[model samples]
Target chain A: SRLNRESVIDAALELLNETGIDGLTTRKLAQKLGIEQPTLYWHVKNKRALLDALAVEILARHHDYSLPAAGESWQSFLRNNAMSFRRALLRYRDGAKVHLGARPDEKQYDTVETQLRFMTENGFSLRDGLYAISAVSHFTLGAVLEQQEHTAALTLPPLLREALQIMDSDDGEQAFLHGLESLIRGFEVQLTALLQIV
Target chain B: SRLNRESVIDAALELLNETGIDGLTTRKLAQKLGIEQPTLYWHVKNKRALLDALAVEILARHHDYSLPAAGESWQSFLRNNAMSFRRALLRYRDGAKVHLGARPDEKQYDTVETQLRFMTENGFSLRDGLYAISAVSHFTLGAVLEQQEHTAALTLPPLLREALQIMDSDDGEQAFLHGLESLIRGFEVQLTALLQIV
Candidate 1:
């Protein structure tokens, strides 16, 4: 049996799919991989480490998703990135929870470089770029977390239901994009103001 | 000792303070409240019900927060609301995690009324107001989630450490406000555009 780090990750991903986040545990993963619990720990260290690896594993799919090309608007880049990120999260149950931890220690260097470069290359200073990226990233994470976790809308009391527009069949994709568009627009305002100041 | 719903909820909140969200369990809570497991379920049905009640209990404290005065802008209303919401989340150990579920079932009728009135009064359509609120709400939730959950930056690699400007002491209050301001700015753009179309 070729048991290696990738195999451990592959097994963890399978466990995640089968059990969801709550049911994903080291003992279960160990049994699935046909290894003793200690061997599993030797590879993943602990549940948090295993999750960190899994987080990286899930995101590694989008490693080659290209950034906005030359002359592409930053707004387009942000929108496209948001959609791509959400799609990745929706690919697995409780996918948003994986990233709820701090960013994985592993560096997706090119992704970070390209994003920061795109912002600063346009008019944003480094700090503003950090804030802008953080805003978009967190907004997307929170949006998808709600979408995946809260699938069932309980029958709401009449008044509050209509006020919040809690529809019975809402899957939250449209709502997700709506909020993302506004956030992008918000970044657009900041960009324009920065340009004006310069 | 009468083990009623209020007493149960009060004990649960104290348990949440003592143990983080992950450690808050029905068994522990029941033991703390001088009740059996069956009695705990009798009071609060299940863990989801218990957590939902806890979520509402936490938010109930903010029910009476005063709204913007008559002539105050919608932006100020949104900004104030975001700050207030973040404060409520910061008050508990895992407050953001509590709100990660769907919004509480209890309708803060007055809170909803003032929020919607403020938006529609300022020329936003009801649907647009919903999107605006969702955008701001999700953004604030995501921001605080990061702030509460990922307070320490010890684990970041050197590359991301510099790239993200993450620091050991970053409580993310300023970063939270920065993002909130950008989101509010984004909503302002939408407001102006909608106004022009009318």
Candidate 2:
């Protein structure tokens, strides 16, 4: 069967939908597309490249951050981007898993770039913008991953959450979560305040 | 050979020290303990149960939340817990992986309860406290998983970072972490303002 890059990607995505990250393979993809697996190489180079493409497809679908209008604050613009990006991740199955492993040549970088543009326009130096991007991106990525893997099962059988609780004082879980949110928020408030001072 | 529940858990921990989560198996544990594999079940019930025990074991090491007077604030207390828990996850090979997929019973429940205690003590109601707990726990788990997997990789890939730069953005990594911190802070600030208004 004759196939182009788009077709191959389409087939690959189908496979991902059916089997997940582990189930995606060149051979399996070829079988699914009814083309030689090497044909995929011609289009996307390797697994990493293909994964990047998938991330781009996801972003194109759900992300719609409005650029900062004249006299608009960068803080507000960046906040919108953060939520939109999170929504994009939430829209796709195992989106964070695929997006996390993608490279700068991939479409995901464009998302960050848009954010930086907002930050710089608002009043961030390039260096400060970098710090801001890193902090926000990691936090979102972390949050997405957590959201992706939420579950609740019994603990005594050696569940990891169980281990933390058992060793934890009478009120460990609640305490840990409270402490975590405050910890991150503390850094953000302090950093923002420092930036304001500078 | 006579085997007890404690001995089985100890053997499981020993296995974790040697082989990671993937390498652990009932057959292997029985061989190491010189007990029939069926006999091993008498103690743990099943492999999932054994893993639950391992999670508990990991948490048992540092479950205390005795904050110092200087760190009496929720912010400081949370930071300390996040840092310590991350360290514990990194202590054993695949420690986080070992505990990821299991139930949250006594051990897990207690962990959440701890956060609730702190949040409520500091003026949060039951629901808000739960949200705070979810936000922190998810963030910590997600971050640690990223760190652990990244550390295990042979070479660092700068492609994602580079892509972010290509979008003319500064530093993607810093922004991500900071962004997450801000989200947490946002929750607190909003909550506090709500309290004032009320």
Candidate 3:
């Protein structure tokens, strides 16, 4: 009667989604999985290792990228990729926080390669292309970190209109998304200029 | 000998620079100032209020703003003010973290109003301009948080370069600034376009 590694990871993710990274520990995870501490240790080396694996799982969760086959520009590709990553991160509690603690090499290796390929093909040198990709990733993570922390999604165009009658400010989410979209557009422009020469 | 609120704020800023925020508690601050906790509270209400004052003090330290001598473009004025605010945040211990925790309606209310007026004069509606201003502030703070947490600056407290090296990412700072500047430029483009119709 041995608990498999998949079972261990699944349990870890469950604990992460519920209690967040700070609330997660090996002993707690073992209890959740109905196993002893040594058994949990046998599956994963330590808390850090477990976190690395969890991060990998998070990234892999959204790797099934479905790009539009017809007339997908670079901006469209990037926006879709970013929104997908955000959706996946928002799936679990403290997803960006957990992702931040884990080394990018462990979780973001394949995604990084894929993104670099997309950028280089579009017109960027490896370096500029990497910058563009990193920008999108950082912006997505930063925005999602704040957005997910909100106890409610009760803001934006609808809330903005409602609040407009009262002359209050509730358009934060819409304004933030507008800024995000604007950044994406700018990234495309800069990437084309920098990569076309590189 | 009477210590005014400004002196108290100055001492707190000094403590922040020397000892970091975690080390700048009320008790510790009183000890540093050769006073007691009650005496310190006479000048500032509590820790949160103290932090709000510190944020204002930080802003004042870096602010040499003069509305760009009356003929400057709103974009230039915004850029200068934004960069000044960011440099001020970078000047103290856990400065951005401290400011992020403080509630609004604090002493530094004038800065926000000034920016709001400038934006509206540049053709922005009240709410739209405010959102634009908020976006810039958040972007600058977020960028600096990532940068200061991982850069080679004394104001940053420790060797963030070492962290980046540990993470093995050579493009850490460059990539961050690139993304931030892109966001800044993107906002300028989008906001200008939106304000034209408004």
Candidate 4:
């Protein structure tokens, strides 16, 4: 029997979560689904498309705030959207890593367009709106990438130890919260200037 | 014969750059260095340390402006430092990927401490200072990760196609530059208020 597209994607996620994007291959996915390589390729364009489908699927499943809420202020929407994305990236093993290999899906067009409209309504041109959206997206992804990418430090400096302690004192939430505010506040700064200039 | 320290790292970069980080293994590095597996482990604590060493040493080789200049303003320092790091990260095949596995090393104490002191002189407490530094660092790294990660999009949406054309018109340099300005301006906005009100 031919594999359904859903079944293929489901199996791909399983393989990715357990072994991560690094170990992922079309052959491995094909084997996981109890199918041959040709069967796997039959369902997708290439291994690259398989990875893209997986990344987009992961977001669609977890990133509920993929767009702004109705009647939400731009500031509130940006912050909440970023928060949702960060959680989405942290949802599985190497979620962000998988994400690095993918990009905005045309399937996400409505959401993306709505976001652009939202920023335009809030007084940004399309280019500025895109930049603001991506700025927040990039910062949020960076924060989550740092969280998801596990690693460490040491080696004899009182201040450096203090810095680590302050950071490790929590789930990195404290610093992220501050960083988020800094970015949002910065946007407001630019917005006010733009409003005056234009 | 012992695997000389400098020689081992030199070979490791070659293997990592040519094959990228995922294929890297202690055994492979051992072979590249022409040394036994035991000798490789002896030089470093384990495979993990080996990755960290490679990550840090890459920065040493290319991340020249790790600290602020003698009289650079905080904003200039943050932006320039981030740009320097972004270049450093792009200097290798999988530069940002290797970075995801490592953290601050004590060997760079002078540079790290000077950065902290520079921020303090400009009005950030240690906690606030670290957040700012890492915020920029994280953004830069995420930007580079997106660059290094090799990645894409399509289909049935006029606005989406417009956005894509607008974006792909260049090497993504436009979005990054605007994003960078927004973050820095956001910080300046915050600082402007603190200065004005207090």
Candidate 5:
């Protein structure tokens, strides 16, 4: 049986949205594909492996800001890329969960290397560049993951009200965006000091 | 059946560790407590409620750095507190997942209000203070949550090798700390300029 690899990923993602990361299974994926169970193995080895593939596929299919534009500042690039990643995760149910433990697709090594070097060219050490990249990545995942999960509300306590107001807006875009800006500003401060040393 | 609420949560956490989060059930918890099935409900409504309790308990039981030292700097407090939380989350299997949708225990509102006000006295607005705290919370979570999940191995590509070294070091303590410092440094930059306007 010949099945397109893209179609397999396509099917997996839809099944992921339909059944969720936990409910997703090879048996159901095969049934959904109208194929035998073993045929599914040609592309993905197991449930976890299928998840690894889905994690990478989510970004590849949905994310476009992985690289900075020719004239984009590192600050703007980090900010935009995070927002893009956030929106990408929001596109599907549990998109953030799918990305956890996501092994980078080996095919994208060159592109990933280039993304890091883009920051290095702008003055981040390889380690610091990675840190900067990881900060944005980590924080975005943390923020998006909370929203993707669940929440609730109740009566206010005095002095707690302002904090509560801010927290309520947390389930909003404002907190995520504010958080990203603060992170980038921090990176810029680090970059400036690094420049002073050079 | 007189069940101490604390004992129920204690049993629930031990069961959570034994079974992993998904396998934890009310029936099993009831049996573990040597109580009749309906008796558990007097303490907790269901699995989600049980998890919410577990999330708060993990921090209360294991995390001391949630509040800053009496005279600590905000920057250091943010840094140390994040580290303390990362440690607490690592203590249990899937601790991070348990915390994902956790509602803050209602008993701690006054303490939370003071923690937020701690930054306000240091020149952060309620929102900025929350952002600072949330950044530390979110980034630590993103960092720790990855460690709690699964992973694997592979090859060397130029440019990628350095990035890989950094990423491999990710399973180490360095990445989480680096991410935290970067996030807090970002908060500092935000706060400094925020003070300028005052």
Candidate 6:
């Protein structure tokens, strides 16, 4: 049977778990799938292209959960989507890293536009809305990457561990939400100040 | 002369620029420094320890700028430190990735304490302050990684590029500060609400 783009991405994601970002090369992926390197290239132009597909694939899982309903508060809207995004990334090894490095896909634009509407409807200027969305994206990505590092806690230095002990708790999901809410609160402050100036 | 910790880190950083994070193995580092792998271990225990040293060294360059002075606003304190931290990370190749993967070091502990004090002094509870500090850290790391990916723009897909056009501008520093300020504003909202509740 001939391989399709879907099958390629599926295999690539599996390879990601087995080999990580550094080891998830096209050559190895082809060998794993028993396909020639050229055939794999027909589906994925390069490593970046393959990673982009994987990024979209991972995020697509959250389609239903991320969309905001009519009259939803901007804060709740952002919180829901951000939490869904983090959960999706956590589903794969090095998923956050992959998402950070992958090219933005069309699906991301829909979310961006929806977020922009949510922000602007709530009184954020367009540019500020972009900043607001970007800030949340960055915050979530950075937080998940940090959470993934917790698997190495047993190896951390004593002094460093003690200092970060407050963050060392196992409740990474709560920690992620805490940070997300804080960033959202920050956005609220900005929106309030902007509204006052207007 | 025996290989020392400083020299090992210096060489490793150089190799990192040449080969990026994945290719920067201890063996390759040793080869670049004309030393044995065992000798490399004498100074740095392993890859994790080496990355920790690099992370600290990178941040140490921003030490004076990140410190909080008496009577300085907590906002100014975090803004100064976050900008300095971003600048240092942009100095190295894949620097943000290196930072995200590194174990927290002793120097990071001092900044954490100072930040914790600044927040608590400014009416933030211990837990909220930690979340605030962490949110800023994640936001900065995630932003820088996105900025670094810009260096590879020519390879990004058309759909991806079009969707991310807003972030493709040359004003990354400005964008960074805007996001940082927004997150700071969010922290202020949380602090205010907490005070009212108290």
In the range B92-189, model 6's lDDT, one tens digit per residue, is 88888778777565556666566677787888767777777778888888888877755543434332344356556554666678888777876776
Model 1 bad stretches (over 4 Å): A63-66, A152-159, A163-170, A195-198, B63-68, B107-110, B151-159, B163-170, B195-198
What clash count does candidate 4 reach? 1
**Per-residue error at A102 for model 6, in Å?**
1.2
**Root mean square deviation (Cα) for candidate 3:** 6.9
TM-score values for chain B across all models: 0.84, 0.74, 0.75, 0.87, 0.85, 0.84
B1-198: candidate 3 lDDT, tens digit per residue: 357877788778888877665457888788878987898778766666787677666767675662454778766776676667666777776776566545443454554556666777778676666555655666666555555433312221122223334334642546655666676667666666753852
| Candidate 3, position A128, lDDT | 67
lDDT: the better of candidates 1 and 5: 5
lDDT of 4 at A90: 81
TM-score of 2: 0.67
Q: Model 6 Cα displacement at B66 (Å)?
A: 3.7
TM-score of each: 0.87, 0.67, 0.68, 0.84, 0.85, 0.84
- Kindly list the per-residue Cα lDDT of model 3 for residues A5-107, writing each as its tens digit: 7777888898887777656889898888887888777787777778778767887865445343355677787777766776777778777656654555533
Docking class of 2: incorrect
Best by TM-score: 1
Model 2, stretches more than 4 Å misplaced? A35-52, A66-72, A106-111, A125-128, A151-192, A195-198, B1-54, B62-71, B93-99, B151-188, B195-198
lDDT of 1 by residue, A1-198 (tens): 346888778888888888877678999998998889888777777777777777777777753344776688888888888788878877877788777864644456666777877888878776677778878888888788776667522314443466555523466676678778777777777767754851
| Model 1: lDDT of residue A40 | 76
Q: After superposition, how far is residue A147 of candidate 2 from its true place, in Å?
A: 3.8
Model 5, B1-198: lDDT tens digits are: 347878888889999888877679999999988888877887888887788788888988998887888799988888888888889998998898898867766866766777888888898877778877877778888877776664321114666787767677547477677667667777776777744851
Give the lDDT of residue B123 in candidate 4: 84
Q: List ranges where model 3 is wrong by over 4 Å.
A: A1-5, A17-53, A62-71, A147-172, A188-198, B1-69, B92-96, B148-181, B191-198
Q: What is model 5's native contact fraction? A: 0.52
Backbone clash pairs for candidate 5 read none
Task: Enumerate clash totals for all models, in the order shown.
Answer: 1, 56, 2, 1, 0, 3
True contacts kept of each: 0.44, 0.26, 0.20, 0.53, 0.52, 0.48
**Residue A54 in model 5: lDDT:** 78
Shift of residue A21 alpha carbon in model 3, Å: 4.4
Model 6 regions lying over 4 Å from their true place: A31-42, A106-111, A150-163, A195-198, B34-46, B152-166, B195-198
